[PDB]
Amino acid sequence: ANRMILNETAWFGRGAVGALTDEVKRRGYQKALIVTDKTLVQCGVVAKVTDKMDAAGLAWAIYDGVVPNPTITVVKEGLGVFQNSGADYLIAIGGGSPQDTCKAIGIISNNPEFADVRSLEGLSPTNKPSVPILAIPTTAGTAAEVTINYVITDEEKRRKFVCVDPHDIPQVAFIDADMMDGMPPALKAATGVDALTHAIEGYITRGAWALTDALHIKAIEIIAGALRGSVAGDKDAGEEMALGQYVAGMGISNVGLGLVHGMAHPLGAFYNTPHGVANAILLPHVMRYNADFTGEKYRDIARVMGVKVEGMSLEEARNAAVEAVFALNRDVGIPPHLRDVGVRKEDIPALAQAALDDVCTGGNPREATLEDIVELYHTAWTS
Amino acid sequence: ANRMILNETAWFGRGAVGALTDEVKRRGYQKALIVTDKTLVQCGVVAKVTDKMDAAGLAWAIYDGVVPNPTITVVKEGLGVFQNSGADYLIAIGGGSPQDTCKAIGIISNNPEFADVRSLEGLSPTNKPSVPILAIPTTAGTAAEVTINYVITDEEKRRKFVCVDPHDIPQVAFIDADMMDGMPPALKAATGVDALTHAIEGYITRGAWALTDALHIKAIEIIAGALRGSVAGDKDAGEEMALGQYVAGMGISNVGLGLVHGMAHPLGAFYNTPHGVANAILLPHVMRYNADFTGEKYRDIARVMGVKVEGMSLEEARNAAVEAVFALNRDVGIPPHLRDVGVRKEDIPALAQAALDDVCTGGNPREATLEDIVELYHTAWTSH
Numbered sequence: 157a158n159r160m161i162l163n164e165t166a167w168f169g170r171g172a173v174g175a176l177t178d179e180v181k182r183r184g185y186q187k188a189l190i191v192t193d194k195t196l197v198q199c200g201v202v203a204k205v206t207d208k209m210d211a212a213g214l215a216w217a218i219y220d221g222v223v224p225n226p227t228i229t230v231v232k233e234g235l236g237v238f239q240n241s242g243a244d245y246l247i248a249i250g251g252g253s254p255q256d257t258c259k260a261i262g263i264i265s266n267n268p269e270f271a272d273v274r275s276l277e278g279l280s281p282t283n284k285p286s287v288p289i290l291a292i293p294t295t296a297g298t299a300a301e302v303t304i305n306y307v308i309t310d311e312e313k314r315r316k317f318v319c320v321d322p323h324d325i326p327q328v329a330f331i332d333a334d335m336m337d338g339m340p341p342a343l344k345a346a347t348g349v350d351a352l353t354h355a356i357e358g359y360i361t362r363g364a365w366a367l368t369d370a371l372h373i374k375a376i377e378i379i380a381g382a383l384r385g386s387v388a389g390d391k392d393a394g395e396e397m398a399l400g401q402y403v404a405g406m407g408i409s410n411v412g413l414g415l416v417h418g419m420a421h422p423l424g425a426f427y428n429t430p431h432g433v434a435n436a437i438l439l440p441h442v443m444r445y446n447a448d449f450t451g452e453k454y455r456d457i458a459r460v461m462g463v464k465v466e467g468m469s470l471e472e473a474r475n476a477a478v479e480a481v482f483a484l485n486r487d488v489g490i491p492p493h494l495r496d497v498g499v500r501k502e503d504i505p506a507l508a509q510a511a512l513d514d515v516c517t518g519g520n521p522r523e524a525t526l527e528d529i530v531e532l533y534h535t536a537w538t539s
Numbered sequence: 540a541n542r543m544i545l546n547e548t549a550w551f552g553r554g555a556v557g558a559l560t561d562e563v564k565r566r567g568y569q570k571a572l573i574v575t576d577k578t579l580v581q582c583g584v585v586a587k588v589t590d591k592m593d594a595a596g597l598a599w600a601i602y603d604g605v606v607p608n609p610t611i612t613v614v615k616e617g618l619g620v621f622q623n624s625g626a627d628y629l630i631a632i633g634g635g636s637p638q639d640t641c642k643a644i645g646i647i648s649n650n651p652e653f654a655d656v657r658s659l660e661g662l663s664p665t666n667k668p669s670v671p672i673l674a675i676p677t678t679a680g681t682a683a684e685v686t687i688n689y690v691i692t693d694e695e696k697r698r699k700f701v702c703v704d705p706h707d708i709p710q711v712a713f714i715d716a717d718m719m720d721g722m723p724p725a726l727k728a729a730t731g732v733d734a735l736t737h738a739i740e741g742y743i744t745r746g747a748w749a750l751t752d753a754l755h756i757k758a759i760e761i762i763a764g765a766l767r768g769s770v771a772g773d774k775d776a777g778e779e780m781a782l783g784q785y786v787a788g789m790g791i792s793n794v795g796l797g798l799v800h801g802m803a804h805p806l807g808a809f810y811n812t813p814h815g816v817a818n819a820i821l822l823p824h825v826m827r828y829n830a831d832f833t834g835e836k837y838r839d840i841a842r843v844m845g846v847k848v849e850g851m852s853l854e855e856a857r858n859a860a861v862e863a864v865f866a867l868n869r870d871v872g873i874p875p876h877l878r879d880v881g882v883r884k885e886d887i888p889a890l891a892q893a894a895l896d897d898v899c900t901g902g903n904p905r906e907a908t909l910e911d912i913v914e915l916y917h918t919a920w921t922s923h
């Protein structure tokens with residue numbers, strides 16, 4: 157049988173964070189720790205929430221110590237701030253980095269033997285649900301509000317590790333494009349292609365089945381339709397991206413991903429490469445590698461990305477799907493090669509061994525060898 | 540903004556009930572009350588679950604008093620059994636009637652001021668979540684496992700009332716076609732067109748938006764593709780129907796339905812008409828009534844039901860969608876007329892007023908008058 161974990165409650169649309177104070181009052185929670193980053197405080201995005209909480213008389217404290225590719229240090233520090241705050245629930249405001257940090261804090265707070273953080277890697281055998289989490293994404297996006305995953309960086313071991321735990325699922329998600337509009341174009345582009353990567357990898361993952369296929373192909377259609385418009389600053393395209401990125405995530409932790417995420421994680425660990433940029437550069441090269449192991453699915457991908465697939469052979473349609481992703485990457489300004497973003501050619505064997513051992517790689521529809529992953533890094537590294 | 544309430548955890552596929560014992564152990568629950576009906580005991584469907592619970596050493600008691608179109612009396616009886624069982628959680632085994640009874644028991648147990656049951660109608664002002672519910676559907680189906688609704692019959696007032704409450708959402712749903720295979724063909728057919736009705740009414744409902752449109756149009760495609768095979772006893776078609784009926788429910792309480800459910804409820808209240816059969820007979824007639832107020836959506840319905848809509852006018856595509864539903868009803872043996880299931884012509888004005896006031900009717904894309912609903916009942920009743 158196939159398991160689906162989803163948010164029991166989610167609010168969608170501009171103004172969705174307007175539902176938060178009523179959700180808190182109905183659940184009887186007394187005090188939030190807001191888990192976020194310094195940028196979202198400074199840009200006034202956190203105030204969009206705390207102004208409503210103040211008006212409603214709801215107490216909060218803040219941890220804004222999250223940094224991109226959050227580390228064991230960031231988690232332990234946040235846990236300390238949570239313990240001292242007296243908070244009884246968590247509000248995650250931000251992209252994947254604050255949402256994942258918030259998941260780690262909420263899990264460890266109710267499962268304190270996991271305070272080393274490393275021991276959470278894999279299918280975390282936690283006895284207790286997380287401290288309740290209300291999740292508010294500000295990127296479009298990681299879908300961290302709806303997955304059972306969180307990704308922590310072990311700086312000492314120079315690796316990203318994935319923690320997979322039904323106990324971390326947020327109680328309520330608020331998917332509000334008002335919270336996302338401040339993303340600079342380059343961040344809309346990067347997080348948008350991360351969302352497309354979730355949807356494409358989830359569509360073709362080894363565990364794919366009818367329900368996740370339906371969700372993923374819809375998310376591909378929405379994201380391919382909206383991303384150029386959103387990067388260009390269109391408000392309605394931004395709301396479409398907010399939905400598309402969430403739908404993309406409804407499959408991620410339920411069926412899995414593949415070698416794009418597998419190969420992106422080591423770049424984040426080695427260089428602190430933004431997750432979305434790493435995925436975007438790798439995506440079309442890994443799609444080419446996987447093409448002949450995906451049955452009819454690249455014809456579907458090409459079709460919903462606006463390719464006229466009628467009369468194409470399956471091999472032509474597969475090529476067309478890859479070219480449609482190359483074209484989207486060029487149009488939204490993703491750097492074309494890994495060498496552009498400071499990846500070192502001599503690190504490729506170490507990156508390739510890290511990618512081969514990454515949990516995401518196991519979902520890849522083609523069984524990757526060390527040599528295959530080395531060649532893929534080389535293909536993505538330079539013209 | 541649009542709210543979606545869904546199951547936090549759901550298991551899908553043949554053998555999904557195999558996940559139940561590990562779910563109970565993980566949540567630390569001590570003793571189940573199983574809420575079900577006598578048919579499911581007799582046919583050995585309940586034993587498919589209790590044998591697994593017995594094997595895993597999990598304690599259970601049973602209330603098997605549920606009847607179709609469950610009454611206030613059935614809710615109070617089941618509540619008494621729950622109170623005296625020492626159970627700390629609920630397992631709903633059955634179609635909409637057991638799943639709705641189970642929601643009522645679970646809500647009233649943690650909100651004991653609603654023991655009169657009538658006080659739950661509408662947006663139930665409950666303060667506490669239901670006793671935790673693990674939902675196992677045996678029809679395909681009402682999708683009661685994933686909605687926040689439950690429908691109770693007030694025998695004294697001869698009416699069905701809808702209770703709407705986020706507090707009633709089951710914690711886990713187990714959607715297992717092994718639990719559904721034993722439905723008689725006529726019940727597969729009726730519950731299957733009820734599922735199609737949820738998907739079609741949900742697709743065209745006034746509150747429809749992008750996410751529910753995507754889910755509903757997929758559910759229509761799955762159900763239209765699978766229902767003939769499932770009724771005929773095809774194993775894979777049965778598994779497809781188990782998924783399609785669930786997806787068809789992901790909008791029932793999230794966006795709403797319309798006049799098919801609005802007109803079906805009074806038939807249940809007046810005659811004890813099976814919910815599925817009532818909806819199946821009404822569906823194509825109400826679709827015809829609604830057609831010109833549904834934008835492009837019947838072209839989408841016609842397309843996923845196998846109609847070649849290329850070069851069709853919008854009205855040709857609408858007529859083809861309606862014809863495809865009439866054809867499916869004939870093809871799985873739904874009775875053609877309300878007269879065939881004992882609906883009385885002289886009751887139509889009373890049925891029409893009840894339908895006009897039904898909560899479901901508010902979602903209908905065409906604004907229905909009493910006179911419109913009287914005429915629709917006549918169209919669905921007549922052998923002409």
Ligand SMILES: NC(=O)c1ccc[n+]([C@@H]2O[C@H](COP(=O)([O-])OP(=O)(O)OC[C@H]3O[C@@H](n4cnc5c(N)ncnc54)[C@H](O)[C@@H]3O)[C@@H](O)[C@H]2O)c1
Pocket residue numbers: 193194195196199201223224225226250251252253254256294295296297298299300303304305306307335336337338339340343347350408431432
């Ligand atoms: N299943 C999961 O939980 C999951 C899935 C995908 C990725 N991830 C993880 O998520 C992380 C990446 O998250 P991300 O891509 O959302 O970025 P992020 O959270 O790392 O943020 C990137 C930068 O964008 C800024 N930013 C975010 N929202 C902004 C806004 N609205 N306006 C202005 N600036 C804004 C942040 O302050 C930060 O400087 C990685 O660690 C990745 O591994 C986890």
Ligand SMILES: NC(=O)c1ccc[n+]([C@@H]2O[C@H](COP(=O)([O-])OP(=O)(O)OC[C@H]3O[C@@H](n4cnc5c(N)ncnc54)[C@H](O)[C@@H]3O)[C@@H](O)[C@H]2O)c1
Pocket residue numbers: 576577578579582584606607608609633634635636637639677678680681682683686687688689690718719720721722723726730733791813814815
């Ligand atoms: N959102 C909701 O909660 C929701 C949605 C739609 C309908 N409903 C309600 O659900 C009820 C109808 O439920 P239903 O259509 O599933 O039917 P049901 O539960 O009323 O059952 C109908 C008959 O089928 C039998 N049966 C069920 N499963 C069987 C199986 N596997 N094998 C053999 N016999 C089986 C039952 O014993 C009964 O005799 C109505 O009261 C309706 O209002 C509620």
Ligand SMILES: [Fe+3]
Pocket residue numbers: 298350353354417431435
């Ligand atoms: Fe990602």
Ligand SMILES: [Fe+3]
Pocket residue numbers: 681733734736737800814818
């Ligand atoms: Fe129904």
